[PDB]
């Protein structure tokens, strides 16, 4: 098992890395590398974290030529897991950066939650269609995902508004919350991910 973590996009990503190393603990031959640029080999599981403006992250994936690299992962049927800003980068565009296109690996766009308490920050419940454990995780975002029902994997409601907190398109996975900051429940979510990549 080879796990890689893009570490260029804005925001803290070391937490994700740590949460993941702590998770990949109880597993055989499972390593972790901070993917800071295009490697020669492809990972079995890749993470696209980050926290910040949609423009940036996109402009950081381009700049350090990771776009083409990420794209090759999906094709070889390599898990590609976005987390927070990185789950939104799986889509086409955002009201955050109107012009700016994103990776576009998943059909949809990113819209600003329609709440007056703009920053959705705190522990909220996530209801999964399957696989992962239902419960409360920690959230810190302003924008959300707008995608067909087909890809919705996890749901959460905030201020009456129901939105996809999780996303999925085969081996590509997205999570809007910070599993690294979600206590015990976060580690099982992180582990379940690694356990899903032990197959392909």
């Amino acid at each position: 098992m080879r796990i890689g973590i893009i570490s260029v996009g804005p925001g803290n990503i070391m937490n994700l890395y740590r949460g993941v190393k702590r998770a990949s603990e109880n597993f055989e031959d499972v390593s972790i590398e901070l993917v800071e640029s295009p490697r020669n080999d492809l990972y079995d599981l890749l993470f696209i974290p980050g926290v910040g403006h949609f423009g940036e992250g996109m402009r950081r994936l381009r700049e350090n030529d990771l776009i083409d690299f990420v794209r090759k992962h999906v094709e070889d049927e390599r898990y590609v897991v976005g987390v927070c800003l990185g789950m939104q980068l799986l889509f086409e565009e955002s009201e955050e950066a109107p012009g700016v296109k994103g990776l576009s690996l998943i059909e949809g766009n990113v819209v600003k939650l329609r709440s007056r308490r703009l920053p959705h920050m705190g522990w909220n419940e996530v209801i999964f269609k399957d696989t992962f454990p239902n419960g409360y995780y920690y959230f810190v975002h302003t924008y959300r995902a707008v995608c067909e029902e087909e890809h919705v994997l996890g749901t959460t409601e905030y201020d009456g508004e129901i939105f996809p907190s999780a996303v999925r398109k085969g081996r590509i996975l997205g999570f809007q919350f910070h599993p690294e900051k979600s206590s015990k429940i976060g580690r099982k979510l992180l582990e379940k991910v690694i356990e899903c990549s032990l197959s392909r």
């Binding site: 920053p119 522990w123 419940e125 900051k181 015990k184």
Partner: protein
């Protein structure tokens, strides 16, 4: 639904946990990191680290603290106490802190609140407001409650939100460390003046006090004594709050 939060405060000095009644016989109560991991195991939703380290050493001891915590903790944490400028804040956040807390340096320079928000986002700014009743009005106090700024609490929470703060840590100097109960009157006073999240701090003594703070409008209840001493089991508390209509983060088996 977004959950009402239970927050644990850890007053720390020169890298260790301290607990007393004042500088008086300020005593040593353990390792900050290991205590945080314990708080995260029982159900605490967030951590607030309040440092009072010497001074010349304040800036380097806090960075060491953040880093030590960031490599082992799995829940969000705020750091504060003596953060007087953008530099100090940015290093703590870049270092691993989720949010910083500023009080005295915020009142003297409201633009600071804004400077941090503009770079890291409101989500990273907690403004701690220490208030007390004085001649019938709610007054703001700085320098650990030793100076009456003359600014009213009503104008200040409004100013604070306007500048960009993302959360308020409201402490009642009157009830702080007394185990009598939270100052629910002060909480209700502030609730209508702002839409920002309110962390109730000061006076926590038993489970019902938490129910009282939340009925007053608090978004989160902070305490240090009670959880440490084990006087309150967080699991019991969350089940008690849920039983009576409060939406809390209930883990499960």
């Amino acid at each position: 639904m977004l959950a009402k939060r239970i927050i644990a405060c850890l007053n720390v000095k020169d890298g260790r946990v301290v607990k007393g009644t004042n500088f008086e016989n300020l005593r040593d109560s353990g390792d900050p990191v290991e205590l945080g991991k314990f708080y995260s195991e029982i159900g605490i939703d967030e951590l607030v680290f309040l440092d009072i380290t010497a001074s010349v050493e304040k800036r380097k001891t806090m960075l060491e603290l953040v880093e030590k915590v960031a490599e082992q903790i799995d829940i969000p944490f705020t750091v504060g106490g003596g953060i007087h400028d953008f530099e100090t804040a940015s290093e703590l956040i870049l270092r691993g802190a989720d949010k910083v807390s500023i009080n005295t340096a915020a009142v003297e320079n409201p633009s600071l609140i804004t400077q941090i928000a503009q770079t890291f986002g409101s989500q990273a700014v907690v403004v701690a407001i220490d208030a007390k009743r004085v001649d019938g009005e709610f007054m703001v106090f700085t320098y650990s409650g030793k100076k009456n700024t003359g600014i009213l609490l009503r104008d200040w929470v409004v100013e604070v939100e306007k500048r960009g703060a993302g959360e308020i840590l409201l402490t009642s100097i009157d009830r702080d460390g007394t185990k009598s109960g939270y100052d629910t009157e002060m909480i209700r006073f502030v609730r209508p003046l702002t839409t920002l999240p309110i962390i109730a701090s000061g006076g926590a003594g038993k489970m019902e006090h938490f129910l009282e703070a939340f009925l007053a409008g608090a978004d989160a209840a902070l305490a240090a004594s009670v959880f440490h001493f084990r006087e309150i089991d967080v699991r019991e508390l969350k089940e008690y709050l849920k039983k009576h209509g409060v939406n809390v983060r209930l883990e499960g088996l």
